[PDB]
Write an enzyme that holds these catalytic residues in place. Structure first.
Site, PDB file in Angstrom:
ATOM      1  N   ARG A  45       0.791  -1.119   0.211  1.00  0.00           N
ATOM      2  CA  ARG A  45      -0.046  -0.188  -0.055  1.00  0.00           C
ATOM      3  C   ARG A  45       0.779   1.195   0.050  1.00  0.00           C
ATOM      4  O   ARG A  45       0.600   2.108  -0.659  1.00  0.00           O
ATOM      5  CB  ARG A  45      -1.071   0.193   1.206  1.00  0.00           C
ATOM      6  CG  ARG A  45      -1.909   1.283   0.951  1.00  0.00           C
ATOM      7  CD  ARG A  45      -3.100   1.128   1.853  1.00  0.00           C
ATOM      8  NE  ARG A  45      -2.987   2.092   2.924  1.00  0.00           N
ATOM      9  CZ  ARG A  45      -3.852   3.121   3.166  1.00  0.00           C
ATOM     10  NH1 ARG A  45      -4.872   3.475   2.302  1.00  0.00           N
ATOM     11  NH2 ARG A  45      -3.674   4.079   4.278  1.00  0.00           N
TER      12      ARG A  45
ATOM     13  N   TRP B   8     -10.939  -8.228   2.792  1.00  0.00           N
ATOM     14  CA  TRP B   8     -11.482  -8.541   1.562  1.00  0.00           C
ATOM     15  C   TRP B   8     -11.513 -10.080   1.196  1.00  0.00           C
ATOM     16  O   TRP B   8     -12.250 -10.677   0.437  1.00  0.00           O
ATOM     17  CB  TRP B   8     -10.731  -8.267   0.395  1.00  0.00           C
ATOM     18  CG  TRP B   8     -10.806  -6.618   0.167  1.00  0.00           C
ATOM     19  CD1 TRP B   8     -11.562  -6.026  -0.482  1.00  0.00           C
ATOM     20  CD2 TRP B   8      -9.824  -5.594   0.826  1.00  0.00           C
ATOM     21  NE1 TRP B   8     -11.307  -4.678  -0.212  1.00  0.00           N
ATOM     22  CE2 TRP B   8     -10.044  -4.535   0.419  1.00  0.00           C
ATOM     23  CE3 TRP B   8      -8.740  -5.736   1.571  1.00  0.00           C
ATOM     24  CZ2 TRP B   8      -9.508  -3.345   1.029  1.00  0.00           C
ATOM     25  CZ3 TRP B   8      -8.169  -4.616   1.843  1.00  0.00           C
ATOM     26  CH2 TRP B   8      -8.495  -3.476   1.600  1.00  0.00           C
TER      27      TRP B   8
ATOM     28  N   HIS C  18       0.584   4.216  -2.578  1.00  0.00           N
ATOM     29  CA  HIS C  18       0.324   5.632  -2.364  1.00  0.00           C
ATOM     30  C   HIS C  18       1.337   6.604  -2.548  1.00  0.00           C
ATOM     31  O   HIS C  18       0.944   7.916  -3.035  1.00  0.00           O
ATOM     32  CB  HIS C  18       0.102   5.639  -0.847  1.00  0.00           C
ATOM     33  CG  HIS C  18      -1.374   5.626  -0.542  1.00  0.00           C
ATOM     34  ND1 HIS C  18      -1.940   6.248   0.385  1.00  0.00           N
ATOM     35  CD2 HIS C  18      -2.367   4.578  -0.937  1.00  0.00           C
ATOM     36  CE1 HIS C  18      -3.201   5.793   0.588  1.00  0.00           C
ATOM     37  NE2 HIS C  18      -3.469   4.954  -0.132  1.00  0.00           N
TER      38      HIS C  18
HETATM   39  C1  HEM Z   1      -9.913   3.256  -6.011  1.00  0.00           C
HETATM   40  C2  HEM Z   1      -8.739   2.924  -5.527  1.00  0.00           C
HETATM   41  C3  HEM Z   1      -8.529   2.442  -4.307  1.00  0.00           C
HETATM   42  C4  HEM Z   1      -9.117   2.947  -3.103  1.00  0.00           C
HETATM   43  C5  HEM Z   1     -10.297   3.961  -2.780  1.00  0.00           C
HETATM   44  C6  HEM Z   1      -8.444   2.317  -1.841  1.00  0.00           C
HETATM   45  C7  HEM Z   1      -8.847   2.277  -0.662  1.00  0.00           C
HETATM   46  C8  HEM Z   1      -8.449   1.427   0.335  1.00  0.00           C
HETATM   47  C9  HEM Z   1      -8.738   2.022   1.716  1.00  0.00           C
HETATM   48  C10 HEM Z   1      -9.921   2.728   2.187  1.00  0.00           C
HETATM   49  C11 HEM Z   1      -8.024   0.973   2.506  1.00  0.00           C
HETATM   50  C12 HEM Z   1      -8.192   0.759   3.928  1.00  0.00           C
HETATM   51  C13 HEM Z   1      -6.702   1.333   4.710  1.00  0.00           C
HETATM   52  C14 HEM Z   1      -6.857   1.199   6.324  1.00  0.00           C
HETATM   53  O1  HEM Z   1      -7.802   0.965   6.857  1.00  0.00           O
HETATM   54  O2  HEM Z   1      -5.806   0.667   6.827  1.00  0.00           O
HETATM   55  C15 HEM Z   1      -7.062   0.219   1.546  1.00  0.00           C
HETATM   56  C16 HEM Z   1      -6.026  -0.521   2.121  1.00  0.00           C
HETATM   57  C17 HEM Z   1      -5.234  -1.136   1.248  1.00  0.00           C
HETATM   58  N1  HEM Z   1      -5.157  -0.913  -0.210  1.00  0.00           N
HETATM   59 FE1  HEM Z   1      -6.279   0.295  -1.284  1.00  0.00          FE
HETATM   60  N2  HEM Z   1      -7.509   1.547  -2.408  1.00  0.00           N
HETATM   61  C18 HEM Z   1      -7.457   1.393  -3.608  1.00  0.00           C
HETATM   62  C19 HEM Z   1      -6.638   1.126  -4.396  1.00  0.00           C
HETATM   63  C20 HEM Z   1      -5.199   0.266  -4.174  1.00  0.00           C
HETATM   64  C21 HEM Z   1      -4.655  -0.340  -5.109  1.00  0.00           C
HETATM   65  C22 HEM Z   1      -4.192   0.459  -6.468  1.00  0.00           C
HETATM   66  C23 HEM Z   1      -3.595  -0.857  -4.424  1.00  0.00           C
HETATM   67  C24 HEM Z   1      -2.442  -1.384  -4.706  1.00  0.00           C
HETATM   68  C25 HEM Z   1      -1.967  -2.122  -5.942  1.00  0.00           C
HETATM   69  C26 HEM Z   1      -4.076  -0.865  -3.030  1.00  0.00           C
HETATM   70  C27 HEM Z   1      -3.677  -1.668  -1.969  1.00  0.00           C
HETATM   71  C28 HEM Z   1      -3.948  -1.634  -0.550  1.00  0.00           C
HETATM   72  C29 HEM Z   1      -3.685  -2.576   0.377  1.00  0.00           C
HETATM   73  C30 HEM Z   1      -2.372  -3.635   0.076  1.00  0.00           C
HETATM   74  C31 HEM Z   1      -4.328  -2.186   1.526  1.00  0.00           C
HETATM   75  C32 HEM Z   1      -4.021  -2.810   3.024  1.00  0.00           C
HETATM   76  C33 HEM Z   1      -3.225  -2.163   3.743  1.00  0.00           C
HETATM   77  C34 HEM Z   1      -3.261  -3.035   5.344  1.00  0.00           C
HETATM   78  O3  HEM Z   1      -3.647  -3.962   5.482  1.00  0.00           O
HETATM   79  O4  HEM Z   1      -3.003  -2.328   6.171  1.00  0.00           O
HETATM   80  N3  HEM Z   1      -5.171  -0.193  -2.985  1.00  0.00           N
HETATM   81  N4  HEM Z   1      -7.540   0.934   0.241  1.00  0.00           N
END
Ligand code: HEM
Length: 291
Positions: free
Chosen positions: A45, A188, A49
């Site tokens: 992530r 997920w 970002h």
């Molecule tokens: C429309 C695009 C996306 C939205 C709005 C978005 C939104 C979210 C949000 C709301 C979370 C939760 C963060 C938390 O509470 O810790 C999250 C986590 C995460 N996202 Fe996304 N994201 C999107 C795209 C992506 C893409 C492109 C990737 C990377 C290739 C990605 C990878 C991750 C991963 C790995 C986490 C989990 C982090 C952890 O477990 O702490 N995201 N995302």
């Protein structure tokens, strides 16, 4: 605005493979973080970002300058939670002070995906730290409570097409949402620290219910205990997205290949590579090294 890649002085593949190994080893060893999910997900992530601030129109943001180290970007509310990945990396940077911030943040993401059994991601060095004045303003990362039209439009600013967007979101299904971080809560899927195509399968086969969470935000909930963001769920609402979701649910390898290409593109956006730059590196995993 041009950003030319400049290899850290005299370093080569072996130098970078060392950095990989150190990251991979600490991933193995600091296993209890986030209820034993580990640091893999937060690292990919972070890689996304720091790259996701790019704007194809004037070549601002993007991974090149490593501006996430500056307080403006570090304190972006959209980056809430990422401080834990930063602090993971900090000792490694100390050990390998010659690598640039941008190269370290992006390689952290490559390392995590490969060590979590994802596909190989070719990677290129040469990102150069730029000054605090080059830090992008907060607000270029995407919202989660929008629809497909939003998602498509958003990603156009990063020169990503529909297939690229769908491969990227599917993202192995890693880690989870955290209520104190984003106002969303839950994972997920069942394998949140193994890279798989489960997100697509879950999307298509679970019974989703639209509910409101304790942060008073709507999310899609399944009886299995999984969740989907509105932006995630919009992938089966849009007819173009839905066909691609179905294709990745039916073809693991295709998904792996497609993601590899898109993630590398994402990590390299805005960067100019001189004709004589080295070819991309493909790092071996600890496993392939018997380490
Ligand atoms: C429309 C695009 C996306 C939205 C709005 C978005 C939104 C979210 C949000 C709301 C979370 C939760 C963060 C938390 O509470 O810790 C999250 C986590 C995460 N996202 Fe996304 N994201 C999107 C795209 C992506 C893409 C492109 C990737 C990377 C290739 C990605 C990878 C991750 C991963 C790995 C986490 C989990 C982090 C952890 O477990 O702490 N995201 N995302």
């Amino acid at each position: 605005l041009v950003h030319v890649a400049s290899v850290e002085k005299g370093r080569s593949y072996e130098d970078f493979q060392k950095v990989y190994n150190a990251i991979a080893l600490k991933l193995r060893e600091d296993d209890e973080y986030d209820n034993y999910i580990g640091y893999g997900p937060v690292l990919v992530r972070l890689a996304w970002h720091i790259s996701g601030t790019w704007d194809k129109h004037d070549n601002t943001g993007g991974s090149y300058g490593g501006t996430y180290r500056f307080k403006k970007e570090f304190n972006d509310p959209s980056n809430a939670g990422l401080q834990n990945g930063f602090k993971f990396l900090e000792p490694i940077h100390k050990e390998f002070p010659w690598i640039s911030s941008g190269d370290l943040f992006s390689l952290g993401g490559v390392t995590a995906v490969q060590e979590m059994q994802g596909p190989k991601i070719p990677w290129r060095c040469g990102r150069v730290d730029t000054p605090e004045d080059t830090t992008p303003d907060n607000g270029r990362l995407p919202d989660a409570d929008k629809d497909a039209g939003y998602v498509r439009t958003f990603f156009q600013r990063l020169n990503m097409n529909d297939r690229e967007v769908v491969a990227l979101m599917g993202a192995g299904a890693l880690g989870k949402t955290h209520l104190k971080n984003s106002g969303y809560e839950g994972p997920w899927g069942a394998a949140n620290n193994v890279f798989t195509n489960e997100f697509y399968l879950n999307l298509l086969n679970e019974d989703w219910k639209l509910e409101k969470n304790d942060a008073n935000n709507e999310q899609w909930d399944s009886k299995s205990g999984y969740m989907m963001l509105p932006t995630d769920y919009s992938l089966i609402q849009d007819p173009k997205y839905l066909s691609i979701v179905k294709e990745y649910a039916n073809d693991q390898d295709k998904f792996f290949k497609d993601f590899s290409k898109a993630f590398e593109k994402l990590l390299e956006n805005g960067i100019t590579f001189p004709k004589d730059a080295p070819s991309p590196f493909i790092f071996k995993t600890l496993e392939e090294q018997g380490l």
